[PDB]
Design a protein around this nucleic acid. Structure first.
Ligand SMILES: [K+]
Ligand SMILES: [K+]
Ligand SMILES: [Mg+2]
Ligand SMILES: [Mg+2]
Ligand SMILES: [Mg+2]
Ligand SMILES: [Mg+2]
Ligand SMILES: [Mg+2]
Ligand SMILES: [Mg+2]
Ligand SMILES: [Mg+2]
Ligand SMILES: [Mg+2]
Ligand SMILES: [Mg+2]
Ligand SMILES: [Mg+2]
Ligand SMILES: [Mg+2]
Ligand SMILES: [Mg+2]
Ligand SMILES: [Mg+2]
Ligand SMILES: [Mg+2]
Ligand SMILES: [Mg+2]
Ligand SMILES: [Mg+2]
Ligand SMILES: [Mg+2]
Ligand SMILES: [Mg+2]
Ligand SMILES: [Mg+2]
Ligand SMILES: [Mg+2]
Ligand SMILES: [Mg+2]
Ligand SMILES: [Mg+2]
Ligand SMILES: [Mg+2]
Ligand SMILES: [Mg+2]
Ligand SMILES: [Mg+2]
Ligand SMILES: [Mg+2]
Ligand SMILES: [Mg+2]
Ligand SMILES: [Mg+2]
Ligand SMILES: [Mg+2]
Ligand SMILES: [Mg+2]
Ligand SMILES: [Mg+2]
Ligand SMILES: [Mg+2]
Ligand SMILES: [Mg+2]
Ligand SMILES: [Mg+2]
Ligand SMILES: [Mg+2]
Ligand SMILES: [Mg+2]
Ligand SMILES: [Mg+2]
Ligand SMILES: [Mg+2]
Ligand SMILES: [Mg+2]
Ligand SMILES: [Mg+2]
Ligand SMILES: [Mg+2]
Ligand SMILES: [Mg+2]
Ligand SMILES: [Mg+2]
Ligand SMILES: [Mg+2]
Ligand SMILES: [Mg+2]
Ligand SMILES: [Mg+2]
Ligand SMILES: [Mg+2]
Ligand SMILES: [Mg+2]
Ligand SMILES: [Mg+2]
Ligand SMILES: [Mg+2]
Ligand SMILES: [Mg+2]
Ligand SMILES: [Mg+2]
Ligand SMILES: [Mg+2]
Ligand SMILES: [Mg+2]
Ligand SMILES: [Mg+2]
Ligand SMILES: [Mg+2]
Ligand SMILES: [Mg+2]
Ligand SMILES: [Mg+2]
Ligand SMILES: [Mg+2]
Ligand SMILES: [Mg+2]
Ligand SMILES: [Mg+2]
Ligand SMILES: [Mg+2]
Ligand SMILES: [Mg+2]
Ligand SMILES: [Mg+2]
Ligand SMILES: [Mg+2]
Ligand SMILES: [Mg+2]
Ligand SMILES: [Mg+2]
Ligand SMILES: [Mg+2]
Ligand SMILES: [Mg+2]
Ligand SMILES: [Mg+2]
Ligand SMILES: [Mg+2]
Ligand SMILES: [Mg+2]
Ligand SMILES: [Mg+2]
Ligand SMILES: [Mg+2]
Ligand SMILES: [Mg+2]
Ligand SMILES: [Mg+2]
Ligand SMILES: [Mg+2]
Ligand SMILES: [Mg+2]
Ligand SMILES: [Mg+2]
Ligand SMILES: [Mg+2]
Ligand SMILES: [Mg+2]
Ligand SMILES: [Mg+2]
Ligand SMILES: [Mg+2]
Ligand SMILES: [Mg+2]
Ligand SMILES: [Mg+2]
Ligand SMILES: [Mg+2]
Ligand SMILES: [Mg+2]
Ligand SMILES: [Mg+2]
Ligand SMILES: [Mg+2]
Ligand SMILES: [Mg+2]
Ligand SMILES: [Mg+2]
Ligand SMILES: [Mg+2]
Ligand SMILES: [Mg+2]
Ligand SMILES: [Mg+2]
Ligand SMILES: [Mg+2]
Ligand SMILES: [Mg+2]
Ligand SMILES: [Mg+2]
Ligand SMILES: [Mg+2]
Ligand SMILES: [Mg+2]
Ligand SMILES: [Mg+2]
Ligand SMILES: [Mg+2]
Ligand SMILES: [Mg+2]
Ligand SMILES: [Mg+2]
Ligand SMILES: [Mg+2]
Ligand SMILES: [Mg+2]
Ligand SMILES: [Mg+2]
Ligand SMILES: [Mg+2]
Ligand SMILES: [Mg+2]
Ligand SMILES: [Mg+2]
Ligand SMILES: [Mg+2]
Ligand SMILES: [Mg+2]
Ligand SMILES: [Mg+2]
Ligand SMILES: [Mg+2]
Ligand SMILES: [Mg+2]
Ligand SMILES: [Mg+2]
Ligand SMILES: [Mg+2]
Ligand SMILES: [Mg+2]
Ligand SMILES: [Mg+2]
Ligand SMILES: [Mg+2]
Ligand SMILES: [Mg+2]
Ligand SMILES: [Mg+2]
Ligand SMILES: [Mg+2]
Ligand SMILES: [Mg+2]
Ligand SMILES: [Mg+2]
Ligand SMILES: [Mg+2]
Ligand SMILES: [Mg+2]
Ligand SMILES: [Mg+2]
Ligand SMILES: [Mg+2]
Ligand SMILES: [Mg+2]
Ligand SMILES: [Mg+2]
Ligand SMILES: [Mg+2]
Ligand SMILES: [Mg+2]
Ligand SMILES: [Mg+2]
Ligand SMILES: [Mg+2]
Ligand SMILES: [Mg+2]
Ligand SMILES: [Mg+2]
Ligand SMILES: [Mg+2]
Ligand SMILES: [Mg+2]
Ligand SMILES: [Mg+2]
Ligand SMILES: [Mg+2]
Ligand SMILES: [Mg+2]
Ligand SMILES: [Mg+2]
Ligand SMILES: [Mg+2]
Lengths: 121, 249
RNA sequence: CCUAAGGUAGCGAAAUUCCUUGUCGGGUAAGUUCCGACCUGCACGAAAAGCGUAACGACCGGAGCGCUGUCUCGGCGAGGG
RNA sequence: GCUAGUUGGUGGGGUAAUGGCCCACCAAGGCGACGACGGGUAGCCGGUCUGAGAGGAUGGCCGGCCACAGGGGCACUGAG
RNA sequence: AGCGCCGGCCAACUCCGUGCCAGCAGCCGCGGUAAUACGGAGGGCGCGAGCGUUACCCGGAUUCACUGGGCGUAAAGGGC
RNA sequence: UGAAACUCAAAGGAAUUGACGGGGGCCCGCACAAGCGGUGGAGCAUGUGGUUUAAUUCGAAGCAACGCGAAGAACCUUAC
RNA sequence: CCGAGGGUAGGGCCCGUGACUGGGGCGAAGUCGUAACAAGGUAGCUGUACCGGAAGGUGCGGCUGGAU
RNA sequence: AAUGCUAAU
């Protein structure tokens, strides 16, 4: 565009979109589990991925992934959720934090224990 | 329970034509197995495919203990092999679903008049002194449910009463059938689920000539024998597990 | 299989629906009427016109507000008998 | 598209003081695509973070100014 | 004395277990009976009273281009 | 005039080497046509599918598996 | 007189929700056909109009991002 | 004149 056109109209800035709107600007959110189940991933992966339906303190109700091998979550469990989507699961945008509230740490975990919330043996 | 007759429904899962061919293989295997155990088999429903498979096949196992011995075959069966519909020689993973139900009863439906209330009253509309003075209109009420049927079609109280009772019987029979069908549908869904590759109950690996039952971790290497109807080892292992699971306390 | 040909658009429990107070939603503390839908149209349907339509109606439905001897439940008074 | 104390004038009231700030009367003006009016959001700055610079984001603590003191309105005392 | 990491980006590799399962994942992607990508072990790399993760901002983004972009066929010349 | 939610990890332009066409051109082969003799019908031999069986060992699967591995299964062979 | 607030009536805008209804995105498998990519077996595309289970067909005109 | 070929190099 010409200089006069830039003076008349300018350049439009770029507005970013939040990928974790249910967090409402917080790093983490507490919630209560309503449904715990397994879901199947999209092509090409094949598995039974453990997820929870979580009703949060911020008013939203979302789906969160449960990482690690084995878990103790069930209906009415209190959990903490953090950002981060699971690529191969449709509509899953959040991760349950292991080792907080009613979500126990991963048993017999020996590597990368700060994730999965396992104490030093 | 374990002593009645069995209804077996085999449906093709994921995999298309190969899935239908695998459903046909399962059908042959179960037919030969039932013959080897002494039962009598009749095919109730059949939907074949052009290549010789079945998209769906429903048959009956008649004999004391048919359901009890076929009750471990319910679920998703997974096959890993090179299809005959495959052109490039790749291995494919397909599934077939098996549903096992106990054959039910055909108890006839009748109206118990002790729970039925009949009211008679004047009809509405034309007729002069006749309709002004006659108790021709009939109402029948099924007291347990509160369902009522009213008949006014004829000038005669007797015919109206008979018609109302007939209509009430048909309505109650329809409701009974609907609830039975809903219960059976829920049972079927609980058995077969979605037919996805996961949630499988048994895997038949042809390249490795291996059969694996994942409920009990039982692997054997006689795939041809199993597919010819030799299911006794797997079934005895499953019965072992069922008897051991009740170790209380 | 049969017909000269097998009902199109639109509308539909209708001034048309027998079962019927169909079913679901609304309105009411409670709604066989009413309104909005569904389609199983006994037996809608295109100039004996079909579907809409602002304005108009001592036409026929349904609801609310205002106000009341209509009523709860009657009482007194006036005049003509 | 907005505006009827609205825009201006005259006289007055009030104030420490100018002023439609307020009132009475007279005129019909004032504002707007250089974005009025309306809606949403927000205390502002010195600065801070980032960036080769230009720019972008931001205004916690510290210094400056403003606003508020349960939610609204009002005046008294007083240099304030 | 701990924490993260060891397929590429990116520094640091072998054995066993499992067998599209369990699981990993920022992107590309790994896993379906010989997996440097899952879990454990031995070893290694980077930091170290810290090491990672989530959220948000700038950078990389010359990807709103003033510095510093474009419009025949990739998005883009208004029918005249 | 003109969005968003949601979703994907690409969607695209030009050119290159192939492959393919019920595109074109020029050619070729018992490919057709021109001929002669067969097979498909019968009986029998033999190999195979299926079915049966205690077992009817195993492999070979369009052309390029089926008088094929087998240029010699009463026992042996022989693997059931 | 003004006046916080309260009351009554009628509007404007926005948000949540609703029997039912319309399409959209997605799917390691289903049913129906085969419209496009080769002259894709009726050259394709296109504005408009009417029609048909569906992709689509046909009429009128236009373009080559087609041939001759 | 002649329709179609799922899904793991
Ligand atoms: K109707
Ligand atoms: K009628
Ligand atoms: Mg210029
Ligand atoms: Mg994978
Ligand atoms: Mg670690
Ligand atoms: Mg009557
Ligand atoms: Mg009469
Ligand atoms: Mg009567
Ligand atoms: Mg009589
Ligand atoms: Mg119609
Ligand atoms: Mg109608
Ligand atoms: Mg109508
Ligand atoms: Mg109705
Ligand atoms: Mg009704
Ligand atoms: Mg009507
Ligand atoms: Mg009726
Ligand atoms: Mg009636
Ligand atoms: Mg009713
Ligand atoms: Mg009714
Ligand atoms: Mg009703
Ligand atoms: Mg209802
Ligand atoms: Mg209601
Ligand atoms: Mg009402
Ligand atoms: Mg109500
Ligand atoms: Mg209400
Ligand atoms: Mg009510
Ligand atoms: Mg009610
Ligand atoms: Mg009702
Ligand atoms: Mg009524
Ligand atoms: Mg009424
Ligand atoms: Mg009503
Ligand atoms: Mg009505
Ligand atoms: Mg109505
Ligand atoms: Mg109605
Ligand atoms: Mg209904
Ligand atoms: Mg409808
Ligand atoms: Mg009806
Ligand atoms: Mg009509
Ligand atoms: Mg006519
Ligand atoms: Mg007529
Ligand atoms: Mg007529
Ligand atoms: Mg008329
Ligand atoms: Mg009409
Ligand atoms: Mg009318
Ligand atoms: Mg009108
Ligand atoms: Mg008018
Ligand atoms: Mg009117
Ligand atoms: Mg009107
Ligand atoms: Mg008028
Ligand atoms: Mg009117
Ligand atoms: Mg008028
Ligand atoms: Mg009039
Ligand atoms: Mg009127
Ligand atoms: Mg009139
Ligand atoms: Mg009248
Ligand atoms: Mg009247
Ligand atoms: Mg009238
Ligand atoms: Mg009237
Ligand atoms: Mg009415
Ligand atoms: Mg009326
Ligand atoms: Mg009324
Ligand atoms: Mg009222
Ligand atoms: Mg009233
Ligand atoms: Mg009275
Ligand atoms: Mg009274
Ligand atoms: Mg009175
Ligand atoms: Mg009363
Ligand atoms: Mg009364
Ligand atoms: Mg009374
Ligand atoms: Mg009363
Ligand atoms: Mg009284
Ligand atoms: Mg009285
Ligand atoms: Mg009295
Ligand atoms: Mg009285
Ligand atoms: Mg009195
Ligand atoms: Mg009295
Ligand atoms: Mg009196
Ligand atoms: Mg008196
Ligand atoms: Mg009087
Ligand atoms: Mg008197
Ligand atoms: Mg008197
Ligand atoms: Mg004034
Ligand atoms: Mg003013
Ligand atoms: Mg002024
Ligand atoms: Mg500064
Ligand atoms: Mg600097
Ligand atoms: Mg600078
Ligand atoms: Mg500040
Ligand atoms: Mg301020
Ligand atoms: Mg305040
Ligand atoms: Mg407070
Ligand atoms: Mg003082
Ligand atoms: Mg003072
Ligand atoms: Mg390296
Ligand atoms: Mg991995
Ligand atoms: Mg890891
Ligand atoms: Mg391994
Ligand atoms: Mg890694
Ligand atoms: Mg490892
Ligand atoms: Mg830098
Ligand atoms: Mg870059
Ligand atoms: Mg920039
Ligand atoms: Mg740059
Ligand atoms: Mg520039
Ligand atoms: Mg560019
Ligand atoms: Mg261009
Ligand atoms: Mg160009
Ligand atoms: Mg293009
Ligand atoms: Mg572009
Ligand atoms: Mg373009
Ligand atoms: Mg031009
Ligand atoms: Mg153009
Ligand atoms: Mg032109
Ligand atoms: Mg997007
Ligand atoms: Mg010849
Ligand atoms: Mg012959
Ligand atoms: Mg023959
Ligand atoms: Mg012969
Ligand atoms: Mg053989
Ligand atoms: Mg072999
Ligand atoms: Mg040969
Ligand atoms: Mg030969
Ligand atoms: Mg021989
Ligand atoms: Mg021997
Ligand atoms: Mg021998
Ligand atoms: Mg809404
Ligand atoms: Mg075409
Ligand atoms: Mg084609
Ligand atoms: Mg085509
Ligand atoms: Mg074709
Ligand atoms: Mg064609
Ligand atoms: Mg064509
Ligand atoms: Mg065509
Ligand atoms: Mg073409
Ligand atoms: Mg073309
Ligand atoms: Mg056209
Ligand atoms: Mg026309
Ligand atoms: Mg046509
Ligand atoms: Mg084809
Ligand atoms: Mg094809
Ligand atoms: Mg087809
Ligand atoms: Mg073809
Ligand atoms: Mg193929
Ligand atoms: Mg194809
Ligand atoms: Mg293909």
């Amino acid at each position: 565009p010409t200089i006069n056109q830039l003076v008349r109209k300018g350049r439009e800035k770029v507005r970013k979109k939040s990928k974790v709107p249910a967090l409402k600007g917080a790093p983490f959110r507490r919630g209560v589990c309503t449904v715990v189940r397994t879901v199947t991933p999209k092509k090409p992966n094949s598995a039974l991925r453990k997820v929870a339906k979580v009703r949060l303190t911020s008013g939203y109700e979302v789906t969160a992934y449960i990482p690690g091998e084995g878990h103790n979550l069930q209906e009415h469990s209190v959990v903490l959720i953090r950002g981060g989507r699971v690529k191969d699961l449709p509509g899953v945008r959040y991760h349950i934090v292991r080792g907080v509230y009613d979500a126990a740490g991963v048993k017999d975990r020996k590597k990368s224990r700060s994730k999965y919330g396992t104490k030093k043996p | 329970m374990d002593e009645r007759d069995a209804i077996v429904e085999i449906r093709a899962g994921t995999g298309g034509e190969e899935a239908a061919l695998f459903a046909r293989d399962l059908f042959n295997m179960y037919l030969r197995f039932a013959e080897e155990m002494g039962f009598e088999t009749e095919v109730l429903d059949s939907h074949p495919t052009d290549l010789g498979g079945f998209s769906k096949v429903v048959f009956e196992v008649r004999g004391p203990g048919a359901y009890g011995t076929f009750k471990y075959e319910s679920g998703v069966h997974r096959v890993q092999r090179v299809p005959v519909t495959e052109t490039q020689g790749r291995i494919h993973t397909s599934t077939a679903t098996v549903a096992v139900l106990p054959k039910a009863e055909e108890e006839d439906f009748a109206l118990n008049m002790d729970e039925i209330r009949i009211d008679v009253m004047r009809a509405s509309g034309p007729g002069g002194q006749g309709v002004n003075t006659t108790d021709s209109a009939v109402r029948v009420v099924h007291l347990p449910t509160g369902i009522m049927v009213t008949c006014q079609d004829s000038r005669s109280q007797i015919k109206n009463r008979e018609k109302a009772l007939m209509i009430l019987r048909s309505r109650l029979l329809e409701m009974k059938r609907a609830e039975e069908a809903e219960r059976l549908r829920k049972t079927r869904l609980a058995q077969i689920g979605t037919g996805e590759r996961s949630e499988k109950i048994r895997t038949y690996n042809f390249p490795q000539s291996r059969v694996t039952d994942h409920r009990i971790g039982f692997t054997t290497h006689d795939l041809e024998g199993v597919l010819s109807g030799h299911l006794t080892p797997i079934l005895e292992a499953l019965k072992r597990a069922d008897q051991e699971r009740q170790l209380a306390a």
